[PDB]
Swiss-Prot record:
UniProt-annotated binding residues for Fe cation 2: C7, C10, C40, C43
Further comment found in the protein's record: Unlike other rubredoxins, this rubredoxin is unique in that it contains two binding sites for iron. It is most probably the product of a gene duplication event. The 2Fe form of the rubredoxin is a physiological form but it is less stable than the readily isolated 1Fe form. Both domains can form productive electron transfer complexes with rubredoxin reductase and accept electrons from the enzyme bound FAD.
Disulfide bonds: none
Job description of the protein: Involved in the hydrocarbon hydroxylating system, which transfers electrons from NADH to rubredoxin reductase and then through rubredoxin to alkane 1 monooxygenase.
Parent-record interval covered: 118 to 173 of 173
This protein's encoding gene: alkG
Name assigned to this protein: Rubredoxin-2
Family: Belongs to the rubredoxin family.
Coiled coil: none
Domain Rubredoxin-like: from-to ranges: 2-53
UniProt organism field: Ectopseudomonas oleovorans (Pseudomonas oleovorans)
Induction data: Induced by AlkS and n-alkanes.
Localization (cell): Cytoplasm
Length: 56
């Protein structure tokens, strides 16, 4: 059950089964294993801007 995260900063949803394609988010990367090193592909901030969509 891949979870998704929405960046409250802009409103971008992340699909654990399809994260970023330019950085290299292979299909199967849970936000848990993605520390702050990863940022938003539309903004460029830390992970604090991303939250869990439903099922929290
Ligand atoms: Cd964002």
């Amino acid at each position: 059950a891949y979870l998704k995260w929405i960046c409250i900063t802009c409103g971008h949803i992340y699909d654990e089964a399809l994260g970023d394609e330019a950085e290299g988010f292979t299909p199967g990367t849970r936000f848990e294993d993605i520390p702050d090193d990863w940022c938003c592909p539309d903004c460029g901030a830390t992970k604090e801007d991303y939250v869990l969509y439903e099922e929290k």
